[PDB]
Amino acid sequence: MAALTRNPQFQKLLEWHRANSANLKLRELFEADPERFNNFSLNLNTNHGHILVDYSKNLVSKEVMQMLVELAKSRGVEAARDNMFSGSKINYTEDRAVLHVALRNRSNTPIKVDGKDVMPEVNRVLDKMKSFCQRVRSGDWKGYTGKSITDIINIGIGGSDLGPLMVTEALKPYSKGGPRVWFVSNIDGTHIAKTLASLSPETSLFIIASKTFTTQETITNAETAKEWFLEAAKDPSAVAKHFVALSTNTAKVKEFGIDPQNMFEFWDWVGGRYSLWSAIGLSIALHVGFDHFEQLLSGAHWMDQHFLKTPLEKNAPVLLALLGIWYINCYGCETHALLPYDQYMHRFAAYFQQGDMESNGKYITKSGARVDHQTGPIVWGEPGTNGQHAFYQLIHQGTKMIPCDFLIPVQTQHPIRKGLHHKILLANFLAQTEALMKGKLPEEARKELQAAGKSPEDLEKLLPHKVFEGNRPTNSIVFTKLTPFILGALIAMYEHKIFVQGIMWDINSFDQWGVELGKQLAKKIEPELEGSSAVTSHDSSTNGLISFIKQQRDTKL
Amino acid sequence: MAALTRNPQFQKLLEWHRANSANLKLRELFEADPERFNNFSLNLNTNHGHILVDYSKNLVSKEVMQMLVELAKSRGVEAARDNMFSGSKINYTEDRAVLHVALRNRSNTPIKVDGKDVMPEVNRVLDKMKSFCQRVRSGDWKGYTGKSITDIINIGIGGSDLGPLMVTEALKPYSKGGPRVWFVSNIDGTHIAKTLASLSPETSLFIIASKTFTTQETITNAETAKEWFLEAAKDPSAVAKHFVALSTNTAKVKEFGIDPQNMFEFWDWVGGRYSLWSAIGLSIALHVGFDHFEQLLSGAHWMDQHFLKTPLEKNAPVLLALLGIWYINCYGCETHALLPYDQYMHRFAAYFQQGDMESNGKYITKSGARVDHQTGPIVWGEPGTNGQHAFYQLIHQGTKMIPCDFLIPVQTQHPIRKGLHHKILLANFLAQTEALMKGKLPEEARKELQAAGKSPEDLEKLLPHKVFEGNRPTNSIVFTKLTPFILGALIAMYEHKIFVQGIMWDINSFDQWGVELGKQLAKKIEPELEGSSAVTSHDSSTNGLISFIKQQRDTKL
Ligand SMILES: O=C(O)[C@H](O)[C@H](O)COP(=O)(O)O
Ligand SMILES: O=C(O)[C@H](O)[C@H](O)COP(=O)(O)O
Structure with missing residues (x-):
């Protein structure tokens, strides 16, 4: 087996998940505990703006977070971080520092x-x-x-x-x-x-x-x-x-x-x-x-120092990493959605699609063992509100559990129409995570359809389709303004999240043998595309596709 | 239970998968059958260019395809299709035609x-x-x-x-x-x-x-x-x-x-x-x-006619749909990647993110029963060759099975340097699906490490990191040129894929009730953002985020 699965703190976490997770209901967690937001969020003052990491709309209790922090300590996250920062050659397959x-x-x-x-x-x-x-x-x-x-x-x-x-x-x-x-x-x-x-x-x-x-x-x-x-x-x-x-x-x-x-x-x-x-x-x-x-560099440096000096239970990248582990290794969620409510951030999700997946899309551990558990998720997303009109239908009413990070600046770079556009953007940002959390009960939808004037036959037909099961967990990451400094801090935060997950999985976040493979592949096929002769050197699909290319490339259209 | 899971052709398929799916190895399937490409591909002649749908690099045998086609038939795909085309009100929750x-x-x-x-x-x-x-x-x-x-x-x-x-x-x-x-x-x-x-x-x-x-x-x-x-x-x-x-x-x-x-x-x-x-x-x-x-419309019309007239076993959108059912409902793959090797197609994946996910991200069947099986996948992707350097690391060496459609025009709109760029692009397109299928055996990687001058100790340690298990299934969709007509046919093809999957799951591909809740909650929050007064009308997270917004919006950075 592998380091994570052999770890007794992980097995405790997993056993607790099997025994107790079905009883975690977000709507009820909030009703029962007025301090939920206060105890499950981090308000970071960088002295150049605040970053609020609100992780309260997650399927977690105090006990879950405690177990996750203990697992991070048991997996040696602090020592590994220190080794990265001190210039140790933690990229062990390439024998390189990671700096x-x-x-x-x-x-x-x-x-x-x-x-x-x-x-x-x-x-x-x-x-x-x-x-x-x-x-x-x-x-x-x-x-x-x-x-x-x-x-x-x-x-x-x-x-x-x-x-x-x-x-x-x-x-x-x-x-x-x-x-x-x-x-x-x-x-x-x-x-x-x-x-x-x-x-x-x-x-x-x-x-x-x-x-x-x-x-x-x-x-x-x-x-x-x-x-x-x-x-x-x-x-x-x-x-x-x-x-x-x-x-x-x-x-x-x-x-x-x-x-x-x-x-x-x-x-x-x-x-x-x-x-x-x-x-x-x-x-x-x-x-x-x-x-x-x-300023961008300085923002990253602030977040670096935050990651280096802060106890794990209050450490933003660590907590994001641990929540990810919970959803990946206990719930089995394949994906992680990044949904910035900011048009300027339109390539943020694509950036971390690379940063996360190229880092942690791995299956061999430091010990040489093949992992017997999930590693990096598939990262995806588009900026809000556009996503609401594209794929949120599936997030709300599909059959997939999808952890989402919702991100937004409080202050817009373009406060047009006396702030009207940003007001609406902010309202949607807030409402969407509220909706994903709360859902809408059959009785709530029934009352709505009754009030709408629907007949008993039409109501009963429509009802189940109008039900939202909810209990869909999110992070909300809100920051004063998207300045170069704050952007630097946010990028660095996710870099360290990726680092922590990699350490916990016992994989090398910093090599890319699959990418190196890629760069060796095309050379064999290149010369075979030259000339009209059939290629028989590969599997019949590769061969057939080459035949098609050769047959079709001279056609006038 | 739901229509799909109660269907005996589905039960047979699932049972076959349980007993036999470990026997399916792409390398072996091609080695055993030199006619594999010929029998697991469709070369469509539209009279305005050819569209080759090569589905041979999939984890399927002749028996599996037969079982899938039988399932499409016994889920009423042919009748449902005819009903769409004739103007029947198949959007049953809204009582609308789908035309x-x-x-x-x-x-x-x-x-x-x-x-x-x-x-x-x-x-x-x-x-x-x-x-x-x-x-x-x-x-x-x-x-x-x-x-x-x-x-x-x-x-x-x-x-x-x-x-x-x-x-x-x-x-x-x-x-x-x-x-x-x-x-x-x-x-x-x-x-x-x-x-x-x-x-x-x-x-x-x-x-x-x-x-x-x-x-x-x-x-x-x-x-x-x-x-x-x-x-x-x-x-x-x-x-x-x-x-x-x-x-x-x-x-x-x-x-x-x-x-x-x-x-x-x-x-x-x-x-x-x-x-x-x-x-x-x-x-x-x-x-x-x-x-x-x-011409765009005419290409779509061609594909509509193909979908309408063609026996299911050689019907392009139907076969694409069935492969998806296989990976979703039998292998449990959450996602489907669209990877066009074409810069002009850079928004193709985002388009079908909506087309697919907003259609089939559903959980209520025609009868009103909740599904007890997966429905629509999370659709994602970026153009090649860029992905090769970014998330293909995870596709090659991660812990997820990710069905991928690779798409490319044979002829480029910009044949610069006497076709050099397009030759390389085509070579990469072909080599990547080949490598995803084949992987790299220990004996192959060992020799590479030996020739690179690695010490016996270093070789031993590096070896498993350089090995690729392969067996990663893809579709290759290759077309003469990306003209308005051909683009129209390709969009229509995926539209009908989505339709077939929806019918098979017994869901409504054509409504979108899941956007309603977020809309309602946003209208409530919008006026609450105005002014300095504390908002306490929601859960503590929503309230806390609003409080942060009100506190931070006047800060001068
Ligand atoms: O994506 C959705 O399904 C709608 O197309 C979107 O909300 C736009 O609606 P409208 O065309 O009525 O403005
Ligand atoms: O994304 C990859 O890891 C590399 O950044 C990419 O292959 C480019 O490599 P280069 O910077 O050596 O050209």
Whole structure:
């Protein structure tokens, strides 16, 4: 078996769930205890706004939370956290440190890897980013025909794309005066082609974002961009005014034709899905300004310190992690929905779909054992209120239990119509979790239909369809305003939630052998697509699909 | 007990699964049967391109498919389908016909509701749409200062938003000569504010899309748009030049102040999530032209005819439905992933999130009995190749079974670099489903670790982390090109998949009672947010969150 299932505190938790969970009814939990909100929420004062983590609408009692905290202690969460923060090589399959926390270590307390403090180099690259941002944003940096830069294009995929994309979308109001930012990621030629169609080579700056600098999609996209650029500029020296690199691989950057002076370095202990805090964040800093990028880092640092110093029973990422364990390993819920009531946060769910699933979508433990329990959930979601009109039907009246985190800023960036839109948005945010909790009893629906004027026949026909069973648990995460600082704190909070779950499951949150597999796969099929000859080298499906491609690719439509 | 679980063909299938499902291994199924692709795929010739539905990489034998087809028959799928097409009121809770098939009924064969052919009115509205499209696209339709329209803004939510958005995104290359299209949906004031910031009142035309014309989000957004417009135009009579309506409710359209000639009508038998084919698709027709809109309709009509005429055992939407039943009701898979290897299709998954989940996220059967089995899955996904770097880690190496549909056009709209990008994209599409099926054996990974120079100790430790169990089932759906016609067929195919699943579960795919409770509770909270007074009328969580909002909304950050 595996560490979690062999753990006596987990077996106690699970046994309690089997014996007692059917008796947990949210509506009744609240009625019985007027202090429920007070005892099952955290109001965090960061001194730059508050974050309220209200976990009271969860299927938990004091005893459940106690058992969960004991399990975290039994699973050695505190020691593991400390090991991450001190630069221990906790990425054991790759023998690497895990130090995204060093990237935003505003205190500058030394963090050592291999006896050497990483902070001087972290800060050197940040200084280089700051200087570069000033030069570009001021209009001082000129293109090959002597014009200021108007457009910045990040080329990268996965960890080198989604962070910068999500954050520049979320912090859009802070981009006034900054250059337009574009993200190219897919190898699909549509992505680069449609982007380049809107650009001038004279005023576009490309950012090639790649830890390895060998990823097929990114290097191919970069080469396509360079070819397009050089067709116009016709001068290799012009590349240095228009192409920069964010990477750990100096040799491959040089090979591509980028000046080492145009290279913004990061390190092997920065996981891609944890990399927006590093040089990978350059497009963020260019778009919103370095000061706002620093505020983002500072928010993360606040949350880092919260995670590091707070007792587990009052520790926000730990509690979120433990509630997840409860739903995943005791209730068996496959999914976790992230539902931010904020259009600017429209890529937040997608970001953590990567952050969570690539981290904890694992099945081998530190001991080499195959897990005999569930690990990471499927993470999904869309911003409210749109979701209410798309898939909430299923959340309310389907056959699935779906833990949801509802997120919203108190203050809107756009208080139009004297705040009318935000009032309605807030009302829906609140009402939805209330509804999921409370439901609507047959007798309550019966009274409603009676009042609506329905005949005894029509009422009886319609009744069961109008019943909401409720008891659907949510987190509500509410924050003063979505500033760069508060966003940094929220991202870091979920990063540490993911960390805690991974430790408890005894898996490595920080490798990605499935992703590494992917990068080895396409090479075998590529040459087989060339020419008209039939391919017989694979299974009949792969073969048949190739035959279809070859048969269909010359047809005129 | 419910209809499905009481069905003897279902009982046989479930019993077969219990006794035999451990014997099903994809690798073995292909090894034992060289005709597997040939017998477990459908190559559909539409006369406007081919659609290959390759379902061979699924955990099914000939016997399993036979059992599934028998179940579809004994659950009344053929009769239920015929009832939909004939205008029977199969939406039994609302007593409505279900006739999105009539909207695209290119044959013009009479379809009666209450003894009246609906086709004349369908065609009348289409004619009106065509005329309006000519007026706007030609530049003949002038704004209040006499200028041609350059921007169209659809305002709507859910069914009045996702379809038009997804289709205009997917068919972008077909929009030459068309006005720019914008989609405002969220009540969050960010959405309309950032949209209006980039527009001129002189050249913008708003399309107010609302079946009911009372949806709070849409009408509020519409009124905000009108306020912005009138600040510039300062003349209420100019509204008629810049606002049109897509509705079933003539009166409410008139109350808002729109010209009755500016109203594009649809009918109660057009479900919101099945509405893009109706007047709701006006923004599509404006963007890509009416001819292309007609091609979209014709593709759907082709698939309607395929669904209607084809024996179940070779009927594409039926087979897709049956595989889903197998994974949902026998394997217990909560989710279904849609993975288009196509940037233009980037909103396809979000569209069917509504189409699928709002239809089949249900728990009450036709008899009024509660289901005692799973219904609709959670639908999710992002375009390839991006997912390969992000959540495919979990698909390959997690603890969840996740049926995936991989979709791709053979021909790209942007064959840059002599087809290099598309070759790579196709190679990845093919290699990923192959790898999901095959995995990687210990003997294969061992040799890789050996060749990489890993020590005997390191190899031993790394090995299980590098092994992939495989046996992960997929569908591959490959089509000649993503044209308006082919896109229409693909959407219609999934519509009918959803229909078949709904009939088999004995649920109503066409109502949405589960949105009501959240709406009611939001109306109650809205006025409570105003002013400084404490709110105590709810549970302590709702009260506490409101208190936090009132306390935090005046804080200056
Ligand atoms: O998402 C993945 O983990 C990586 O970030 C992605 O494969 C890109 O890798 P690169 O930064 O080395 O190009
Ligand atoms: O998604 C829902 O089913 C509806 O389409 C949505 O609420 C919009 O309703 P309306 O078209 O009546 O405004």
